[PDB]
Amino acid sequence: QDPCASNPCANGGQCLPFESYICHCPPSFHGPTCRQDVNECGEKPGLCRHGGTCHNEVGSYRCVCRATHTGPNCERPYVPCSPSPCQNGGTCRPTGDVTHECACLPGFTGQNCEENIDDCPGNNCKNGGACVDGVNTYNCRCPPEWTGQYCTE
Ligand SMILES: [Ca+2]
Ligand SMILES: [Ca+2]
Ligand SMILES: [Ca+2]
């Protein structure tokens, strides 16, 4: 005769007997069986600090920060070069309050030096050798019957 044996609650709620039953919900859900989402933005205005916009979700919320701030609740100020966004040992230079510039190392390119420049366009791999791109170079993956740097030996 346990009413909780049927498992009436959902989304992490704990069933407890009382007189029928009750579902003790986690803070992210509410209602008789924890099936309705709590709007965190509505319960605490200014949840996303420094003029951030709160967006409610099923089981959580997300903060949309303005360019000048960062963090889960837009609390940490945005510094263009700390943490540094440039990839592959690239040097970061700030150009403004929110804009930045990456000085790429030879071989890399793009806004944040994330793209490796393809060195295969003018490759000299012969006899069906496949050009494999590297950092400022390339190597030919030769078929089994051919050897050498350009698949000629
Ligand atoms: Ca509701
Ligand atoms: Ca929510
Ligand atoms: Ca390359």
Numbering used by the authors: 141 to 159, 161 to 294
From the paper:
The Notch receptor is a key component of a core metazoan signaling pathway activated by Delta/Serrate/Lag-2 ligands expressed on an adjacent cell. Notch signaling requires cell-surface expression of a hetero-dimeric transmembrane Notch receptor, which has a large extracellular portion rich in epidermal growth factor (EGF)-like domains (36 in human Notch1 and Drosophila Notch). Key to understanding receptor function is structural knowledge of the large extracellular portion of Notch which contains multiple repeats of epidermal growth factor (EGF)-like domains. Here we investigate the EGF4-13 region of human Notch1 (hN1) using a multidisciplinary approach.
